Amino acid sequence: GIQRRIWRRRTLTKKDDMLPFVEEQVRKIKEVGKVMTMDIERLLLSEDNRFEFVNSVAAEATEYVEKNRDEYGGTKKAIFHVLSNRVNDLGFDRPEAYAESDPYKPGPGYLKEY
Amino acid sequence: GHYALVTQQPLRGRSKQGGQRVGEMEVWALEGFGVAHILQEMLTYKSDHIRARQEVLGTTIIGGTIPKPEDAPESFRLLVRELRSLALELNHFLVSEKNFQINRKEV
Amino acid sequence: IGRVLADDIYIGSRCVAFRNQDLGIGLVNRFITFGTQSISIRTPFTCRSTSWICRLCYGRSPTHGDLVELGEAVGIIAGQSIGEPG
């Protein structure tokens, strides 16, 4: 197979027949937090027992709270941080603790009405 | 808020600012889910664990993690005294899995 | 569907289903399609205990699709499932 270097490129050489208005939908999904539901489902695909998964998540969140008490309880939640870190540990980028706010709030004191 | 004098459980009724009852059918549902720590929350330190009710009030205001009660709620201690009044003694023992020492729980 | 085979299943000299294997609907249809007369499965009646059950004797989870998980309170679910439509 050696010739001078020149070599044969590998190609499909066969036919396989198996080869856009969702902006509001994707944005709403991100706003409500369904990406976290997908992440939770994905994390359990590698867990033999879901009860052990819940226990380990709770223990990690407890460690987070004990180490840095004042960073959690408000816009940052310990369990959300644990879930994001576990998703981030796989190489998939996620916002920290799924913490998001509304950029369209019309100044301080104004509360969004559902 | 206010709890019953004997059972030390939260009062009953909207007018009395009482709490909601978690009946035995609600306990079955939690056992079906396997949520063993939600069940213990509503069995000890949200209902009648006098010592652990006060600490939950303090930890949540400082956000410093709630530990397990590990003691008996006042409803079990109430039952033990009543069984004592029928000349019956009910003791709770813990056997260590390390050195097999029998520990008598205060009840 | 969802039961765990207690014995190997053979078609001629070929093994089409192994012991300790969850029974899918494709396997069941294959058994019906061919001339398979006897199927041996693990049920709650076959477990070596009346105080607990094991994963293989119970079978697949009623809601989670896979095999049932350790620590599941299947007795309370069984009791609730029958009494609910009463």
Binding site: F51 | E31, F33, G34, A36, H37 | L70, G71
Partner: peptide, 17 residues
């Protein structure tokens, strides 16, 4: 459920230089 299965040398000895 979740309750199943119980849930100094080398110091004070550096090179004087």
């Amino acid at each position: 459920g979740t309750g199943f299965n119980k849930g100094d040398i080398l110091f004070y000895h550096r090179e004087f230089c």
